[PDB]
Amino acid sequence: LTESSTSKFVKINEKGFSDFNIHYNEAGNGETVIMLHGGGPGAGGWSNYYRNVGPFVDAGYRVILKDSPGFNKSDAVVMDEQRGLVNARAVKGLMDALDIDRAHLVGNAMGGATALNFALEYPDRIGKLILMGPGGLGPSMFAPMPMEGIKLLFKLYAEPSYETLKQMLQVFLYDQSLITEELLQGRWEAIQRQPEHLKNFLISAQKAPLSTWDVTARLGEIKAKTFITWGRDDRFVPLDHGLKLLWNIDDARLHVFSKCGHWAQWEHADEFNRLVIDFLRHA
Amino acid sequence: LTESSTSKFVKINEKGFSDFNIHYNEAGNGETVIMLHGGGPGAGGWSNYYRNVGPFVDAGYRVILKDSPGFNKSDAVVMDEQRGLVNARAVKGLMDALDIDRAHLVGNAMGGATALNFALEYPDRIGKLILMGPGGLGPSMFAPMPMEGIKLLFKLYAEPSYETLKQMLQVFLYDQSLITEELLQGRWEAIQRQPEHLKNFLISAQKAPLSTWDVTARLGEIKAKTFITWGRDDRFVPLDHGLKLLWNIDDARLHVFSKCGHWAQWEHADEFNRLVIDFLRHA
Amino acid sequence: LTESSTSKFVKINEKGFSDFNIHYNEAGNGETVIMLHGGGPGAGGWSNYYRNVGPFVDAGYRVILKDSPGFNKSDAVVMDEQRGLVNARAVKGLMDALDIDRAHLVGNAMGGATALNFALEYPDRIGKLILMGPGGLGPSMFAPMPMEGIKLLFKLYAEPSYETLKQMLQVFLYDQSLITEELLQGRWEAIQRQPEHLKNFLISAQKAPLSTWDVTARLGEIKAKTFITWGRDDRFVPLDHGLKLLWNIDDARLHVFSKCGHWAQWEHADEFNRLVIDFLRHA
Amino acid sequence: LTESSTSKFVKINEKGFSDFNIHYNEAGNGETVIMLHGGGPGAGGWSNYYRNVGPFVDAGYRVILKDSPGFNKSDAVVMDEQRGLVNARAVKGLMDALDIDRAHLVGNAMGGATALNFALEYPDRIGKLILMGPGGLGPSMFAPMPMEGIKLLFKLYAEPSYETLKQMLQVFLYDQSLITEELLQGRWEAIQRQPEHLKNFLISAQKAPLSTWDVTARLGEIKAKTFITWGRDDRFVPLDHGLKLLWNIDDARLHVFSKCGHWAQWEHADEFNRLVIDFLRHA
Ligand SMILES: O=C(O)/C(O)=C(F)\C=C\C(=O)c1ccc(F)cc1
Ligand SMILES: O=C(O)/C(O)=C(F)\C=C\C(=O)c1ccc(F)cc1
Ligand SMILES: O=C(O)/C(O)=C(F)\C=C\C(=O)c1ccc(F)cc1
Ligand SMILES: O=C(O)/C(O)=C(F)\C=C\C(=O)c1ccc(F)cc1
Ligand code: NA
Ligand code: NA
Ligand code: NA
Ligand code: NA
């Protein structure tokens, strides 16, 4: 499987979106799992999940790696509402366009917020819910905010440079030996390719700050079986939010990886794939 | 598999133990996994692990459900050192007697302390380490101590009664509908059968209080791959100790079950069995 | 100062209350500080605050120790809304009847919930806010709920006995040597005197469970300078809620007493009095 | 009081130190309080405590603002042992030279580690103990380490620049409006004045990493009445260490300031001065 061989586009039409182009990477043909990426500059479906797509497909799932609005190859957009909710509407739009009745969702960070909003807004359209360090869940009981990683994300959006990208990735990942030339060059290309997405993201963030994303008060509504993962060493979203979700969602479990930053599905891909595939099969 | 069909005895000889009788339940014939029980009145190997032995054996392991010294059908003993260490010596004694070179250890509560001590004292004799709410790891950052469950455990040791047993089990388990007549009658029988074990436990606890069990300072020595589990709703050992282990052991992960008390391997047996078998196979 | 010499009654009329009798103990004549008690069986203003009234009066404050509706010498009531809000309406009713424009509030547990609700509903009527382990602020990130102390409070309400009272006080206080015959006899008398309050409390709790009390989502509205205290060893309301308040209220500080249960103003009266008087004077 | 008018030097002789020059600022003449500064580049007694010296002197204390070895105007040194212990020996050396029998200690960060080590090593020479975010107390249960602030401290030591200083101060303080030209210029001067201290600090840190500073296991030995303060928003030492100290020291209390970074005695000087003076007077 490659980015090119799996690449597809679909126009969506859903509450606010009109003939809006969504890019996604699709492989496999079984039960649908939609994987939703984080909000960093240059983020996208393939780049965030390419270590996961193969094993999930091998396990018999149809995997859709979705580019959220205003990221990668999806259409440019300025959002005046919190991104989790707007992104969730776009997932629903994609599912309607592709005739998908129910999907399992996997979401990291912004994608975790998207998945939570989707579960809240469209409970009859979700199977299981997999959350990796979801963002926007209000204050931490321990971590000063904005967190270290978030400050760097905003620096890189506002003043993109190769050096600042490197600094961000050093904070993003626990094991520094994972920061290869390939990773750096690839992430730098995606930032250079879409400067309009960078500008639009910053405008959107002024209109709807991270405080507007907090859906904590509604977590008791979630009826989906939920698997929460966290990196022990995540400098972007606070570990105690893993506990917040575990206490507030009816049927959840929490798995914390040691020696792991903000990209658990990539930093601990083998363990992540095994645990999440087992969850989808047996929970 | 039944208690009777799996029941075996072996005399051990190891640092302090001389021709000391250990009872254990054995099934299967592959790689050895020794499962170590908690310290409540009437506790033992079979009673604590009978929902786990079958699936582990099916997975190809040889399972040994060990009765710790001063419990169930093992010999009576008064201990003047912390139980985790004394119990670990007894595991080594059993392995030497049975010609077992290396074992995976699974330990709940007192059994978790036993397993940690074993990993520290005999690192060349352990494979992987599975810890379910290990006891004795010092103060909690949040929970007043002694914890609610521990107060009840001491009440039941000192004044055993059917009513006090019921009260303890209500705190021990999250889902009250798991407290069947069978569970109550069985636990009551094991308490009635061995009053000397109750008396000896209390004498031992005066000689070596829970504060003597704390091996926190040595956790950096543990080289075993470690899987830590906790019940979210454990009223016997504090949830934050799961974090303590995760930060201090080199190669660990933490899994927390929602709606789960102090007997995770029984209350969430299916998920526990799947996760731990996968860990032993693939980690 | 004695209970008898300070005892006063006033009829209140405020949203739901019609000619409703409120008992209070008053001393001093300066700036008004209203102290609000917890929700345990037999609780009241004088009993909960008699170690505080003198020093506050000496410092130049007018101290009002209010009996909440359905407690001690105030009128009996069955509440169908969360007690914090209903109690707050009663404080407003008292202040209107006594021609008090603004008051500083001190509230422990239920009284802390009352004080938070008062600050939210009537921001122009509050000076400073002092909270000692306020109750009803949703789940803990660490403590299983209901907490140990709360289970005992409900046991004592439903089946009042001298032995159960003693058990509750043992959990309520850290230092067991504070449980004198005087304390026990006094608390037992207040329970015996008002069996109707016990029955009504339990009916009220069925109509509006503790989950209905949670005002967390509104804490950002509080503009009062706030001093939060917690007992390190509080088995009734969880320590992490001290952090919740500290992160969510604009201008707060948190003080945690070691070796202290659920009655900090009594268990650490000297330090409590000094800190709170300094706060009222200088903050 | 000014830096110049209070400036004194004394040669010390104590376990490893031979005719070693210590600079300190002294004012007042009552009971001695020694204030101990943090470990950032350019740190010193006067600079760290000039908002505290006046009120403590007014309260009747003799205040000694000590420059630790290898800082400000004290002699240059390369340390091969953990700085807390070496610094404590230097405090003892100063007290012996000045004929001071007992001192109250106030210590922030490195100075908090110094004060803890002093209490452990010389219990008969300490009065009360005041700790503001002490450093080196092992891992956090929540914060990835090294913490954000610590990474910046090491960057500034290794590559001192005006821009990096500004970045560090932005993380060091919660309220950005406290970063005046005066603060920046002053801190920059102290860095420019003593480049040898910067180089020596880095050599020392290689010889004895922060892990060597951890005295957690010995906290039960501390018999001094202890007052622990923390900034809620401290990005240099983790908030949960405030809890660690509170649970492990016999007689402690914890006060947490909201809207406060790593320099609580300066950022919340009025409240800090009032609380600590009251503690010294009445505890
Ligand atoms: O995971 C990524 O792709 C990435 O580069 C990120 F930095 C993701 C971070 C978030 O999406 C994020 C959103 C919201 C929040 F509160 C915290 C973090
Ligand atoms: O799991 C059991 O069998 C049981 O009945 C227990 F209550 C086990 C508890 C412990 O072994 C225990 C030991 C030490 C400790 F600190 C806390 C709990
Ligand atoms: O402080 C008392 O008077 C007392 O006897 C109590 F047990 C008070 C407890 C509460 O008011 C309480 C209310 C709500 C809650 F969530 C937890 C505790
Ligand atoms: O407070 C200061 O003067 C300062 O500039 C600091 F950054 C102090 C920090 C420490 O001394 C420090 C030491 C050890 C540690 F683990 C964490 C922080
Ligand atoms: Na490499
Ligand atoms: Na049943
Ligand atoms: Na006494
Ligand atoms: Na200014």
Secondary structure element (H or E) that encloses residue D165, with its range: helix D162-172
At residue D224, what is the residue type?
Answer: A
| Residues of B recognised as catalytic | 262
Q: CB–CB of A228/A251 below 8 Å?
A: no
CA separation for the pair D86, D213 (Å, rounded): 11
Question: Any idea what DSSP says for residue D231?
Answer: E
Q: Both tokens of residue B115? A: 């397993």
**C-alpha of D256 from chain center:** 17
Residue C261 phi, psi (nearest 5): -85, -140
How many angstroms is it from B179 CA to the middle of ligand 6?
Answer: 8
How many angstroms is it from D194 CA to the middle of ligand 3?
Answer: 57
Measured between its terminal Cα atoms, the distance across chain C in Å is: 28
Query: Angle formed by the axes of helices B195-207 and B148-158, to 10°?
Result: 130
Measured between its terminal Cα atoms, the distance across chain D in Å is: 28
Closest CA to B69 of B108, B12, B121, B124: B12
CA separation for the pair C9, C67 (Å, rounded): 10
CA separation for the pair B251, D166 (Å, rounded): 38
Top mutation candidate among D145, D153, D155, D178 for ligand 4, by most atoms within 8 Å of CB: D153
At residue A162, what is the residue type?
Answer: Y
B262 lines ligand 2 (CB under 6 A): yes
| Rounded-to-5 percentages of helix, strand, coil across chain D | 45, 20, 35
Q: Is D263 annotated as a binding residue?
A: yes
DSSP reduced 3-state for B222: coil
3-state secondary structure chain C: CCHHHHEEEEEEEECCEEEEEEEEEEECCCCEEEEECCCCCCCCHHHHHCCCHHHHHHCCCEEEEECCCCCCCCCCCCCCCCHHHHHHHHHHHHHHHCCCCCEEEEEECHHHHHHHHHHHHCHHHEEEEEEECCCCCCCCCCCCCCCHHHHHHHHHHHCCCHHHHHHHHHHHCCCHHHCCHHHHHHHHHHHHHCHHHHHHHHHHHHHCCHHHHCCHHHHHHCCCCEEEEEECCCCCCCCHHHHHHHHHCCCEEEEEECCCCCCHHHHCHHHHHHHHHHHHHHC
C112 lines ligand 3 (CB under 6 A): no
Number of cross-chain residue pairs from C and D with Cβ atoms under 8 Å apart: 51
Answer whether the bond into residue D146 is a cis peptide, omega within 30°: yes
Closest CA to C100 of C45, C62, C131: C62
How many angstroms is it from A184 CA to the middle of ligand 3?
Answer: 56
Instruction: Ligand 4, residue D39: give the atom nearest the CA.
Output: 11
Q: B167 CA to chain D: closest CA distance, Å?
A: 29
Residue B253 phi, psi (nearest 5): -140, 160
How many angstroms is it from A273 CA to the middle of ligand 1?
Answer: 20
Q: Is B48 annotated as a binding residue?
A: yes
Q: Is the dihedral of CA A191, A197, A200, A204 positive or negative?
A: negative
Residue having the nearest C-alpha atom to atom 2 of ligand 1: A38
Residue B164 phi, psi (nearest 5): -70, -35
Query: Angle formed by the axes of helices A148-158 and A162-172, to 10°?
Result: 160
* Residues contacting C126, CB < 8 A, separation 6+: C102, C103, C104, C105, C118, C119, C224
- Whole-Å CA distances, A40 to A151, A164, A190, B252, D276: 11, 12, 11, 28, 45
CA separation for the pair B30, C22 (Å, rounded): 74
Helices (H), A139-237: 148-158, 162-172, 181-193, 195-207
- Residues of chain C neighbouring D270 (CB-CB closer than 8 A): 282
Cβ atoms < 10 Å from Cβ of A195:
11
Q: CB–CB of A79/A58 below 8 Å?
A: no
Match 């390419």 to its residue by tokens: A50
Closest CA to B238 of B105, B168, B149: B149
Match 């008087």 to its residue by tokens: C277
D237 lines ligand 4 (CB under 6 A): yes
CA separation for the pair C207, C204 (Å, rounded): 5
C45 lines ligand 3 (CB under 6 A): no
Phi-psi region of D222 (alpha: psi -120 to 50; beta: other; left: phi over 0): beta
Q: CB–CB of C69/C39 below 8 Å?
A: no
CB-CB: which of B139, B217, B240 is closest to D141?
Answer: B240
CA separation for the pair D162, B101 (Å, rounded): 61
- Residues of chain A neighbouring B253 (CB-CB closer than 8 A): 255-258, 271
Q: B79 CA to chain A: closest CA distance, Å?
A: 36
Phi-psi region of A42 (alpha: psi -120 to 50; beta: other; left: phi over 0): left
Secondary structure element (H or E) that encloses residue D27, with its range: strand D17-27
Query: Angle formed by the axes of helices A269-282 and B269-282, to 10°?
Result: 150
DSSP reduced 3-state for A99: coil
Residue C183, judged by CB atoms within 10 A of its CB (0-12, 13-18, 19+), counts as: middle
- Whole-Å CA distances, A108 to A92, A188, A229, A243, D268: 18, 21, 9, 16, 38
DSSP reduced 3-state for D88: helix
Residue D77 phi, psi (nearest 5): -160, 145
CA separation for the pair A247, B232 (Å, rounded): 8
Cβ atoms < 10 Å from Cβ of B27:
18
Give the CATH class of C1-283: alpha beta
How many angstroms is it from A259 CA to the middle of ligand 6?
Answer: 43
Match 């003198």 to its residue by tokens: C54
CA separation for the pair A130, A107 (Å, rounded): 6
* Chains in contact with chain D (at least 3 beta-carbon pairs closer than 8 A): A, B, C
- Are B141 and D244 an interchain contact pair (Cβ–Cβ within 8 Å)? yes
CA separation for the pair A133, A121 (Å, rounded): 20
- Are B252 and A258 an interchain contact pair (Cβ–Cβ within 8 Å)? yes
Interface of C with B (CB under 8 A): 140, 142-144, 148, 232-235, 238-240
- Are A141 and C243 an interchain contact pair (Cβ–Cβ within 8 Å)? yes
Q: CB–CB of A220/A123 below 8 Å?
A: no
D37 lines ligand 4 (CB under 6 A): yes
D48 lines ligand 4 (CB under 6 A): yes
Q: Both tokens of residue B75? A: 């010999």
Q: CB–CB of C186/C47 below 8 Å?
A: yes
Measured between its terminal Cα atoms, the distance across chain B in Å is: 28
Residue B124 phi, psi (nearest 5): -80, 0
Cβ atoms < 10 Å from Cβ of C14:
17
How many angstroms is it from D158 CA to the middle of ligand 8?
Answer: 30
| Rounded-to-5 percentages of helix, strand, coil across chain B | 45, 20, 35
Closest CA to C110 of C142, C77, C136: C136
Query: Angle formed by the axes of helices C195-207 and C181-193, to 10°?
Result: 70
Residue C164, judged by CB atoms within 10 A of its CB (0-12, 13-18, 19+), counts as: middle
Q: Give me the half-sphere count of Cα atoms (radius 13 Å) on the Cβ side of residue A128.
A: 21
CA separation for the pair B135, B38 (Å, rounded): 9
B220-233 in b/e burial notation, b at 16+ Cβ within 10 A?
eebebbbbbbbbbb
| Residues of C recognised as catalytic | 262
* Residues contacting D97, CB < 8 A, separation 6+: D10, D11, D12, D13
CA separation for the pair D10, A195 (Å, rounded): 61
- Are C256 and D246 an interchain contact pair (Cβ–Cβ within 8 Å)? yes
Helices (H), chain A: 3-6, 45-49, 53-58, 83-97, 110-121, 148-158, 162-172, 181-193, 195-207, 240-248, 264-267, 269-282
**Closest-approach residue (CA) in chain C for A239:** C141
Q: Give me the half-sphere count of Cα atoms (radius 13 Å) on the Cβ side of residue B77.
A: 24
CA separation for the pair C243, C237 (Å, rounded): 12
Closest CA to C13 of C123, C94, C126, C103: C94
D38 lines ligand 4 (CB under 6 A): yes
- Are B142 and D243 an interchain contact pair (Cβ–Cβ within 8 Å)? yes
Answer whether the bond into residue C146 is a cis peptide, omega within 30°: yes
CA separation for the pair B37, B84 (Å, rounded): 11
- Residues of chain B neighbouring A278 (CB-CB closer than 8 A): 274-275, 278
CB-CB: which of A139, A141, A217 is closest to C141?
Answer: A141
At residue B210, what is the residue type?
Answer: L
Residue A256 phi, psi (nearest 5): -115, 125
The angle formed by the CA atoms of residues B245, B249 and B255, to the nearest 5 degrees, is 50
Top mutation candidate among C117, C183, C239, C262 for ligand 3, by most atoms within 8 Å of CB: C262
- Are C142 and B235 an interchain contact pair (Cβ–Cβ within 8 Å)? no
Helices (H), D33-132: 45-49, 53-58, 83-97, 110-121
- Whole-Å CA distances, A275 to A65, A107, B3: 19, 15, 32
Q: CB–CB of D103/D32 below 8 Å?
A: yes
Closest CA to C173 of C46, C265, C243: C265
CA separation for the pair B99, B32 (Å, rounded): 11
Domain boundaries, chain A: 1-283
CA separation for the pair B257, D65 (Å, rounded): 51
Cβ atoms < 10 Å from Cβ of B70:
23
**C-alpha of C205 from chain center:** 17
The angle formed by the CA atoms of residues C114, C120 and C124, to the nearest 5 degrees, is 110
Q: Both tokens of residue A210? A: 């991270």
Q: Which residues pair with D132 in a beta bridge?
A: D108, D229
The angle formed by the CA atoms of residues A55, A56 and A59, to the nearest 5 degrees, is 85
Length of chain A: 283
Secondary structure element (H or E) that encloses residue B200, with its range: helix B195-207
Residue B265, judged by CB atoms within 10 A of its CB (0-12, 13-18, 19+), counts as: buried
Q: Is A138 annotated as a binding residue?
A: no
- Residues of chain C neighbouring A217 (CB-CB closer than 8 A): 217
- Are B240 and C142 an interchain contact pair (Cβ–Cβ within 8 Å)? yes
**Closest-approach residue (CA) in chain D for A144:** D233
C123-151 in b/e burial notation, b at 16+ Cβ within 10 A?
eebbbbbbbbbbbbbbbbbbbbeebbbbb
CA separation for the pair D196, B101 (Å, rounded): 56
CA dihedral D112, D115, D119, D124 (to 10 degrees): -150
Cβ atoms < 10 Å from Cβ of C262:
28
CA separation for the pair D142, A143 (Å, rounded): 8
Question: Any idea what DSSP says for residue D90?
Answer: H
CA separation for the pair D192, D186 (Å, rounded): 10
Query: Which of these is catalytic: D104, D262, D268, D282?
Result: D262
Resolution value (Å, 1 decimal) = 1.6
Residue C119 phi, psi (nearest 5): -60, -35
CA separation for the pair A148, A166 (Å, rounded): 15
D238 lines ligand 4 (CB under 6 A): no
DSSP reduced 3-state for A254: strand
Q: Is D248 annotated as a binding residue?
A: no
